[PDB]
Each structure stands twice: as structure tokens, then as C-alpha cells.
């Protein structure tokens, strides 16, 4: 990204973890725990994302 765009530490942490969750749930990174990925939080990912 360019130096012009700004953010906050908490906002950037949220963006990073959101990206990680999407990659894990969509089988993009191997060895993802299939038991953990069925938690109620991840089932409702359509509104928790």
C-alpha cells in the first residue's frame, strides 16, 4: 500500500484476523482444524465477518 492510506492498530489487527479466518475456512491453507472451524461463531460468519 501507499504511505497515504492510514489506519489504527486495532483496525489493522481486525483486518488481518478477518483475512486469516477467510483463508482457513475456505481450505486455502492446509491442516486447518475441521473441528474448530464448525464453531457457532464460524457458522454465522456471514454476519460475523
Amino acid at each position: 500500500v501507499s504511505s497515504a492510506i492510514k489506519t489504527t492498530r486495532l483496525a489493522e489487527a481486525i483486518a488481518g484476523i478477518q483475512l486469516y479466518i477467510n483463508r482457513a475456512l475456505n481450505r486455502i491453507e492446509p491442516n486447518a482444524r475441521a473441528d474448530v472451524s464448525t464453531r457457532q461463531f464460524f457458522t454465522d460468519w456471514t454476519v460475523n465477518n
Partner: protein
């Protein structure tokens, strides 16, 4: 990444630091050292003063 909109319009107004005005130029008279004439010994006239 480059701080543009979906259409490509920039989102930050730029600056250029306006050029520094016209310039004043002046001329001046110049003088130099000048000498004078000399005096020679005088002739003796044939006539009275």
C-alpha cells in the same frame, strides 16, 4: 492501495508551493578617479600687462 476511488479519482488534494514572485533589477551610475591639467613655465610677453 494508491488512495484512489473506484473510478480512479485521487482522494488527497496536492500542493506545489507557488513560485516566489517577480524579481526587481536595478542599475546604477559608476564613477572613477579623474585627474586635472598641469601647468608649464610661462613665456615672457613683449607687451605690458
Amino acid at each position: 492501495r494508491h488512495n484512489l476511488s473506484i473510478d480512479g479519482q485521487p482522494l488527497s488534494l496536492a500542493i506545489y508551493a507557488e513560485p516566489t514572485d517577480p524579481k526587481a533589477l536595478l542599475t546604477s551610475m559608476v564613477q572613477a578617479s579623474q585627474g586635472g591639467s598641469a601647468v608649464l613655465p610661462g613665456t615672457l610677453s613683449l607687451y605690458r600687462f
